[PDB]
Design brief:
The complex is a heterotetramer, with 2 copies of chain A (5 residues) and 2 copies of chain B (125 residues). Chain B has 125 residues and is an alpha+beta fold. Helices cover 53% and strands 14% of the residues of chain B. In chain B, helix 2 crosses helix 3 and helix 5 runs antiparallel to helix 6. The chains are: B alpha+beta (125). The interface between A and B is small, with 5 and 6 residues. Bound molecules: the ligand CC[C@@H](O)Cn1c(=O)n(C)c2ccc(Nc3ccnc(Cl)c3C#N)cc21 (2 copies). Chains B, C: It comes from Homo sapiens.
Chain lengths: 5, 125, 125, 5
């Protein structure tokens, strides 16, 4: 996997 | 919301599963006929990848057809290469097929594929 | 062939177009009912994203249903958040919805979502 | 975008 888009 | 997290591999994993449904002929809802070669597919994936199919399947009559016949000038191998690209993001571009793939991508209205074909041809001339 | 080129943004662009078809209710083929809240979707996208829907729509009888009713314990907001994630890769996880999203993802068999929910909950305790 | 995968 997750990220801050 | 603007506070969402995102799963980097999600879109590619969805496409991998749609391609596995296609390989197993699960919930395919249209046959594309190219010079007597038949290709089973999902209308939604075709529409998502092609300006031509988006126009066909949003038409109030054509949306209900289970068989679509392409122009007789379309090369079945070129179509097969592009259908595989739709479902995998992988384009099998070779010296021996590039002219047919580009002509097919122009007909199907697949802009980024046409652009790359143009660049690969320009590099060889 | 192993000589393919690849279009990095293709899978995300396909998903963007499938979500635009969903927003416009184009070629949606199932209604998911959650405690009297109705959600229209494409069976193939649900199957590609969820172990529960993959099992339902590969069943020889259930594949033909146009309405699927979920367990009454399922929270409609949790389902809505997960349906949006299926079509966008974006998960709207908040303190006020995480328990419902995790319970829904466990029911829908969405492994990576369950894993992230577990990690975000563990960090707060 | 294109790349060698
Ligand atoms: C995946 C990459 C994409 O650019 C492929 N493509 C392309 O080159 N042209 C010219 C396209 C035209 C229409 C569509 N399809 C849609 C466009 C807009 N709104 C919707 Cl809902 C859909 C659907 N389905 C896809 C196209
Ligand atoms: C997109 C990320 C993916 O991991 C989501 N997901 C998940 O967590 N479980 C447990 C899943 C089980 C089945 C499926 N669906 C498929 C699995 C295998 N073969 C096919 Cl054809 C399909 C289709 N459609 C998707 C699942």
């Amino acid at each position: 996997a997750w990220v801050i888009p | 919301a603007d506070s969402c997290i995102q799963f980097t591999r999600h879109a590619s994993d969805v496409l991998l599963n749609l391609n596995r449904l296609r390989s197993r002929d699960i919930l395919t809802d249209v046959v594309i006929v190219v010079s007597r070669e038949q290709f089973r597919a999902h209308k939604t994936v075709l529409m998502a990848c092609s300006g031509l199919f988006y126009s066909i399947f949003t038409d109030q009559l054509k949306c209900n057809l289970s068989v679509i016949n392409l122009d007789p000038e379309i090369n079945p191998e070129g179509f097969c290469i592009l259908l595989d690209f739709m479902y995998t993001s992988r384009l099998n571009l070779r010296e021996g097929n590039i002219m047919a793939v580009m002509a097919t991508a122009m007909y199907l209205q697949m802009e980024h594929v046409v652009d790359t074909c143009r660049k690969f041809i320009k590099a060889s001339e």
